[PDB]
């Protein structure tokens, strides 16, 4: 585990000692690797920057440059945390707590998302030690990648107004059913802006010279549309692909460079990496020993290493 | 058998053993007489072929996403946040459910004068006695028992079918409801009709009748009682179903 | 001192006799009391009254009525066979 | 927590016979304090 | 049937105390409850004078 | 304390459980009262003799 | 968008005062109400012919 | 019709079924026309109507001409006519006399 | 340590294993019966079908394709009509008498003499089991009478034999550490620590025809509270067929009386057009 | 309870819904049961045994030997009202063991031996301490 | 380690037994990690996801989903595999069977699809119980990322026709990708759905960005720094592509999530992450086809 | 006869079928029971409305 401890610094509200008991299996973001550390850098008051608190995109950027840690065992003197970034060498598969409305799967990669849900705030309050605690919500990673694209684009609509007030909310989610509504309260600009720029600048490099030949086959896409099932379902209705349909540009130097093969490389370099440069890295994977295929809300799932 | 995990050590213990029938004749019959309750509420649910995607769509786009969302618009089985290339159809789970699991109703076109006296009876959907039991042991017989409509129907003996739009090869149940073509079957919803219209599964299927009835306290079902609207069976968690049909 | 019935046995020398609490007040608890105070006579206890265990019934297999249909017998190393299987006449 | 939990440490000091047995979790909304036997507990030692 | 072999009558002149009280028109909070989360434009032919 | 039954194959392996629940006394206090009229006390005291 | 027997609820224009103009300046959609005058104003899925 | 009277209630059936024995009626029998319940302390009624959110139909019919046929059970009662319609009982009170 | 507290919490690990070792060693004997409920029901045909199957074989034999048909055409009628007979006719009596007695001997005796028999306290050997659920056994016994209920004999032969099971009591402790010297010796002093602070076994032996069975129900004893579905419950899956929107043939368009299903006099009588509705 | 107890066996959303529709029709059926088809002598008998056999026996107490009638113990209470018990006496169960009962007298515990010291110096006061307190000095030598 | 057992089913032949003797040291995928498993969780028939046989996409969904296991010792009535994904890093040495490239002393080899090589090679079938064990191919990280982008590039020229992409030298050897005679006609119909995924994620985004960035910067730190590192790159791509192609905000930002939702799918689909490492001891540092190699647990 | 009941009225459409009645039902026309839910933290009032 390469054991790391966090002590109980000063005093105890006597029911709130039991509040630390039911947080077993949650995640602490501690911005270090320590053998002992105070509880002051733990809470959300440390997540608050100079003067201002981060938004749910800034908390992504706040959870960027800190280190997650697993609650292992809860003492009245200390709390032993295992440093996820290094000390994931656990054949004992140190256990986590699922605090999420989604019943997951077996075999999901699990990445951490700030509490942004309408009813799972994960707000526990300490008044003897005046601190506020937001636990991250562990979620499956495609469902995690369906969230971060919404919240930045919702902040993309925070730059430009123009349109009438009835906008698509980006606030109805879909997992097999299960209509989810999240919170849209505040959108800090710099958390939107720096997230928007890497969405711009990576999509710059992901276009290359041999990429341009693929753009010719855009009318070839709709030729498969009215003659099969798979393509017509692949072609989305709310897509620009159905909108843009309504050429080599020769410039041929040398022609032994494999121009089409080189196109799919650098496209995958930056447009292939769009979930992980915006959000947190997944290192938690669902692995139950008993053959249980799903893990209930509130359960203690065994946790294995990087996916 | 030991295995060391997080926390402490974790001993697992197993004892290998076997059995045998040890009876030359039949032993141990099992009757079935009392019912607690139906699991399903016996029906009234449309089938949605937009759950599947194998069918080649319309070519005009103005008819394509007009007729698509004309049906899907509010169905109890209606794919919202629509069909990913990789993923699931995401059946809309509603908030509360009362009577139990749902049954699924599927449809086969029939002519209007296919007389009702063929019904009121244990008669079959595809208009033909379709089982592999009924044949005369020729081993090329059950394609001709299912399709040779120069012959008759063993179920209704004075005729060949009851529905020409069900029975024959490429008789439109044969395109929709045969899993070898599977325009559907990308859908997680269990089709009730896959037991019929499947020449591959009833391709002789087994024929020794004596062994056949002991498997009717066996043969894990097509259905699973674990979902809100019933799904085709995930490969884990077998159920030892009875299922005579 | 806090538990007053404990101090009914002093078991040690009250010995210095200097002006208490005009010193450092380093005490975690101390009460500068006159001749009497009502809290001296309070008696309280939170008591423990009950603990019960159920029997875990170890039920052997050669008890129940379904022992009749089976003739179980010891054979080790059945993991080592691919066939030990039974052949019978009629 | 522990002033209910000492009762389970006092249940570790047993005298009390429980007569009839059904599933406990069906009456989860009945007790004042519930603990769950899961083969082990690192606290009870 | 009442608490006997009685038979009673609930003819719809019974409705005079329920609905005719002047709260039937009182729908100010309903439009105040729906007008947030505003609607998209819905091609108003017959909504406009 | 609950027993278990060892299954096999696709169903997961089991492990024994324990419960340890704790319950709390509630305190009721029920009441009776009675009276003596004013004429009776000095009779019981020995005054009016 | 149907709530009451004596009224109607229809997605109209945002702010435009009714006795004026030729084409409404279609901006945001704000829903509004109106009074149903007679018993005949109710829709014919709620009354057979 | 108060969703808050739904929202304030929980859902685990370990605890739910025992208040069906002893719950508070909103009605009191202690007045001539029945009233909204005063703070006259409690009732301890049975009242299954809250826990199931239900109501029961009784023997009623649009005309007496159906109600005469409604006697001696649902064996032969005219369930409907031209525009006239009957609702046979469905209740815990079925089978009973009053 | 030299503290008794060190010895006292050393006790509370021993009184943790001493409840756990009986739990897993119990779980095999519980698991032994659960296999028998699988391996019987895996070879159990449903008895609405075998009562004609034997009387098909109550001939010479026939494979001449005619008897194969007349086997099936009677087999489907016995299942379509009498499958759920108890409960289908529970109002009757002296048919449930006849229903059991064929079910008592629809099967045939195996190639088996046990050499260790279960008695009946007089002399009578037992030749059947008849496992039933708890709910069915209640209303069956009080209406369909009834016997002396004590099994005089049930021998502890070489069938379970926990003397071979005592290895993993010691060897699992030996697989880890020096707990092997303890874990067998502790079981001696655990007999009064965990518990409290060829023989007769009770059963129920109904005799029907000229036979005798151990009519005994489970799940009140050895399936309860373990989160296990009781294996004598299950699913019959039956597909259903409803013709929808079809049309009356040319012969059956009558009314069976003059004045019936008649509308109010200014109304079209909608029963005269092809139906699309359906009711169930 | 009588269906509700059946789902507490064998160990789930479909099991939740299939309960409740089954439950509300069973409530509409099997209630006010004595006045409904009380002519059926047979129906009351099996209805009485589900009154007799539905609840869960808790951990038995050895002390109060509340047995009566020459040695068979007493395992139920069944307090009813007046007219029902007479009607239950009159026709349905005219089934009488005796009219004779052997109850017991009170039990008690008073803070005597060390319970005093554990209450006025310590806080925790163990019921039947000394039988536990000796055996806490007995188990460690086994 | 924590060795897991896969149960051999009933009666197989001696060539079916010898088929189990030609697989000692292969790679096996399994859904759950139960200590006793069956063969029904192993076979290619256990990869059905929509009622049909999976493609190389439908395998690579599961090949990134379920769990690798490597059979150390083969058995009657059991299959012993010490699985990779359990255990601490760089412990529990296991042994693999090489396929035609080297697998040098390092490389961190990756499990991937069979039909990128000979399709009915390593599709070993059991004859008695009639199931199919299509073992994945352990390729090292540079070449595994190389060949995956070539055939889908070859699928483009096979899509809508009118150099030769298939030579692809290794360090020493000349690796014949083309197994012509019957495979390549089955290649472009078994990567059939997959080529559409590499295309549609390009046609959507590029035609989305050219109506995103002109709709951006005027609807300012990201504004001037948009083409700061993209001077004569993005404006040149605005000069080249927007001219020889065609040219709406509320469907646009709705399409923004949907494309990038598909993008997050493909990163989990593609790029073939390393799972196990070759870093042996006292070897010749160079493995040949058909020879064992000591393989250690974690990248 | 005893204490009086109080009949309240609710505006319903005339072509809401009698088949919904002669059956234990809500007066509102939609099920609203919290016991019908499945603990999703949104299967409260969004069941009812």
From Swiss-Prot, chain B:
Belongs to the herpesviridae major capsid protein family. The chain holds residues 1081 to 1325 of 1374 of the full protein. It is found in: Virion; Host nucleus. The gene is MCP. Self-assembles to form an icosahedral capsid with a T=16 symmetry, about 200 nm in diameter, and consisting of 150 hexons and 12 pentons (total of 162 capsomers). Hexons form the edges and faces of the capsid and are each composed of six MCP molecules. In contrast, one penton is found at each of the 12 vertices. Eleven of the pentons are MCP pentamers, while the last vertex is occupied by the portal complex. Homomultimer. Makes the hexons and eleven out of twelve pentons. Interacts with triplex proteins 1/TRX1 and 2/TRX2; adjacent capsomers are linked together in groups of three by triplexes, heterotrimeric complexes composed of one molecule of TRX1 and two molecules of TRX2. Interacts with scaffold protein; this interaction allows efficient MCP transport to the host nucleus. Interacts with capsid vertex component 2/CVC2. Interacts with the small capsomere-interacting protein/SCP. This is Major capsid protein.
Curated annotation (Swiss-Prot), chain F:
Coiled coil: none annotated. This is Major capsid protein. It comes from Human herpesvirus 2 (strain HG52). Belongs to the herpesviridae major capsid protein family. It is found in: Virion; Host nucleus. Homomultimer. Makes the hexons and eleven out of twelve pentons. Interacts with triplex proteins 1/TRX1 and 2/TRX2; adjacent capsomers are linked together in groups of three by triplexes, heterotrimeric complexes composed of one molecule of TRX1 and two molecules of TRX2. Interacts with scaffold protein; this interaction allows efficient MCP transport to the host nucleus. Interacts with capsid vertex component 2/CVC2. Interacts with the small capsomere-interacting protein/SCP. The chain holds residues 100 to 148 of 1374 of the full protein. It comes from the Viruses. Self-assembles to form an icosahedral capsid with a T=16 symmetry, about 200 nm in diameter, and consisting of 150 hexons and 12 pentons (total of 162 capsomers). Hexons form the edges and faces of the capsid and are each composed of six MCP molecules. In contrast, one penton is found at each of the 12 vertices. Eleven of the pentons are MCP pentamers, while the last vertex is occupied by the portal complex.
């Amino acid at each position: 585990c390469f054991e790391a401890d966090i002590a109980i610094p000063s005093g105890i509200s006597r029911p709130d000692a039991a509040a630390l008991q039911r947080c077993e299996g949650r995640v602490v973001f501690l911005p270090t690797i320590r053998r002992q550390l105070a509880l002051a850098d733990v809470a959300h008051e440390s997540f608050v920057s100079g003067g201002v608190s981060p938004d749910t995109l800034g908390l992504l950027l706040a959870y960027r440059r800190r280190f997650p840690a697993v609650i292992t065992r809860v003492l009245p003197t200390r709390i032993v945390a295992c440093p996820v970034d290094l000390g994931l060498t656990h054949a004992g598969t140190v256990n986590l707590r699922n605090t999420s409305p989604v019943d997951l799967c077996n075999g999901d990669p699990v990445s951490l998302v700030p509490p942004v849900f309408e009813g799972q705030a994960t707000d526990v309050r300490l008044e003897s030690l005046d601190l506020t605690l937001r636990f991250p919500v562990p979620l499956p990673t495609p469902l995690a990648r369906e969230i971060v694209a919404r919240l930045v684009a919702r902040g993309i609509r925070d730059l430009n107004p123009r349109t009438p007030g009835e906008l698509p909310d980006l606030n109805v989610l879909y997992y097999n059913g299960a209509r989810l509504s999240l919170v849209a309260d505040v959108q800090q600009l710099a958390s939107v802006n720096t997230e928007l720029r890497s969405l711009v600048l990576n999509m710059v490099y992901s276009i290359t010279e041999g990429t341009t030949l693929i753009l010719t086959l855009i009318p070839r896409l709709l030729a498969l549309s009215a003659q099969d099932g798979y393509v017509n379902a692949l072609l989305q209705m709310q897509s620009v692909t159905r909108e843009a349909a309504q050429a080599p540009m020769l410039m041929q130097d040398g022609e032994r460079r494999l121009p089409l093969y080189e196109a799919l490389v650098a496209w995958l370099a930056h447009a292939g990496q769009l979930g992980d440069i915006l959000a947190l890295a997944p290192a938690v994977r669902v692995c139950t020993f008993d053959g249980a295929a799903v893990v209930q809300s509130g359960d203690m799932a065994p946790v294995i290493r990087y996916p | 058998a030991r295995h060391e995990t997080g926390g402490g050590v974790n001993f697992t213990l197993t004892q290998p053993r076997g059995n045998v029938d040890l009876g030359v004749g039949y032993t141990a019959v099992a009757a079935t007489g009392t019912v607690r309750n139906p699991v399903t509420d016996m029906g009234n649910l449309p089938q949605n072929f937009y759950l599947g995607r194998g069918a080649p769509p319309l070519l005009d786009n103005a008819a394509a996403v007009y007729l698509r969302n004309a049906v899907v618009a509010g169905n109890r089985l209606g794919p919202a946040q629509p069909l990913p290339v990789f993923g699931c159809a995401q059946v809309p789970r509603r908030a509360g459910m009362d009577h139990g699991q749902d049954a699924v109703c599927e449809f086969i076109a029939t002519p209007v004068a296919t007389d009702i006296n063929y019904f009121r009876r244990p008669c079959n959907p595809r208009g033909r006695a379709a089982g592999g039991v009924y044949a005369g042991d020729k081993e090329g017989d059950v394609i001709a028992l299912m399709y040779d409509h120069g012959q008759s129907d063993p179920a209704r003996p004075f005729a060949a079918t009851a529905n020409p739009w069900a029975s024959q090869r490429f008789s439109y149940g044969d395109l929709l409801y045969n899993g070898a073509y599977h325009l559907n079957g990308a859908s997680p919803v269990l089709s009730p009709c896959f037991k019929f219209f499947t020449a591959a599964d009833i391709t002789a299927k087994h024929r020794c009748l004596e062994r056949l009835i002991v498997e009717t306290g066996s043969a894990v079902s097509t259905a699973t009682a674990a979902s809100d609207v019933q799904f085709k069976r995930p490969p884990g968690c077998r159920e030892l179903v009875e299922d005579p049909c | 001192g806090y538990r007053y019935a404990a101090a009914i046995l002093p078991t040690g020398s009250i010995l210095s006799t200097i002006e208490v609490a005009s010193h450092r007040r380093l005490f975690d608890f101390f009460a500068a009391v006159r001749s009497d105070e009502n809290s001296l006579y309070d008696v309280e206890f939170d008591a423990l009254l009950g603990s019960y265990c159920n029997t875990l019934s170890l039920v052997r297999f050669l008890e129940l009525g379904l022992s009749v249909a089976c003739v179980c017998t010891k054979f080790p190393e059945l993991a080592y066979m691919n066939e030990g299987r039974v052949q019978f006449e009629v | 927590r522990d002033p209910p939990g000492y009762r389970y440490a006092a249940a570790i000091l047993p005298t009390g016979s429980i007569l009839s047995t059904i599933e406990v979790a069906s009456h989860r909304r009945l007790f004042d304090f519930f603990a769950a036997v899961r083969s082990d507990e690192n606290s009870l030692y | 049937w009442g608490k006997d072999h009685q038979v009673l009558r609930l003819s719809m002149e019974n409705a005079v105390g329920t609905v005719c009280h002047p709260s039937l028109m009182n729908i100010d909070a309903a439009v105040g409850g729906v007008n947030h989360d505003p609607v998209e434009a819905a091609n108003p032919y017959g909504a406009y004078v | 304390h609950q027993p278990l039954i060892a299954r096999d194959g696709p169903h997961p392996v089991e492990q024994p459980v324990h419960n340890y629940m704790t319950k709390v006394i509630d305190r009721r206090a029920l009441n009776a009262a009675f009276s003596l009229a004013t004429e009776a006390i000095a009779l019981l005291t020995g005054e009016a003799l | 968008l149907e709530l009451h027997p004596a009224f109607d609820f229809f997605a109209g224009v945002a702010d435009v005062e009714l006795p004026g103009g030729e084409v409404p300046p279609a901006g945001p959609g704000a829903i509004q109400a109106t009074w149903r005058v007679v018993n005949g104003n109710l829709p014919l899925a709620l009354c057979p012919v | 019709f108060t969703a808050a009277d739904i929202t304030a209630k929980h859902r685990c059936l370990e605890r739910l079924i025992v208040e069906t024995g002893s719950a508070v009626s909103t009605a009191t029998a202690a007045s001539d026309v029945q009233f909204k319940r005063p703070p006259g302390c409690r009732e301890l009624v049975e009242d299954p109507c809250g826990l199931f959110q239900e109501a029961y139909p009784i023997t009623c019919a649009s005309d007496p001409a159906l109600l005469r046929s409604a006697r001696d059970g649902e064996a032969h009662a005219r369930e409907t006519h031209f525009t006239q319609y009957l609702i046979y009982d469905a209740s815990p009170l079925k089978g009973l006399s009053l | 340590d030299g503290t008794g507290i060190s010895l006292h919490r050393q006790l509370r690990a021993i009184q943790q294993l001493a409840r756990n070792v009986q739990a897993v060693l119990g779980a095999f004997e519980r698991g032994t019966a659960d296999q028998m409920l699988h391996v019987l029901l895996e070879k159990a045909p449903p008895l609405a079908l075998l009562l004609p199957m034997q009387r098909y074989l109550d001939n010479g034999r026939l494979a001449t394709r005619v008897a194969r048909a007349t086997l099936v055409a009677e087999l489907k009628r016995s299942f379509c009509d009498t499958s759920f007979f108890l409960g289908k006719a529970g109002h009757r009596r002296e048919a449930i008498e006849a229903w059991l007695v064929d079910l008592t001997t629809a099967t045939q005796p195996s190639v088996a003499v046990p050499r260790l028999t279960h008695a009946d306290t007089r002399g009578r050997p037992v030749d059947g089991v008849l496992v039933t659920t708890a709910a069915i056994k209640q209303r069956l016994l009080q209406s369909f009478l009834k016997v002396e209920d004590t099994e005089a004999d049930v021998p502890v032969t070489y069938g379970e034999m926990v003397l071979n099971g005592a290895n993993l009591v010691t060897a699992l402790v030996m697989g880890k550490a020096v707990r092997s010297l303890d874990d067998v010796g502790r079981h001696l002093l655990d007999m009064q620590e965990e518990q409290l602070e060829t023989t007769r076994v009770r059963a129920d032996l109904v005799a029907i025809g000229d036979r005798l069975v151990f009519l005994e129900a489970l799940e009140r004893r050895i399936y309860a509270a373990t989160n296990v579905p009781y294996p004598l419950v299950g699913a019959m899956d039956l597909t259903f067929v409803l013709p929808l929107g079809l049309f009356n043939p040319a012969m059956e368009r009558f009314a069976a009386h003059a004045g019936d299903l008649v509308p109010a006099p200014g109304h079209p009588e909608p029963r005269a057009f092809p139906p699309r509705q359906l009711f169930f």
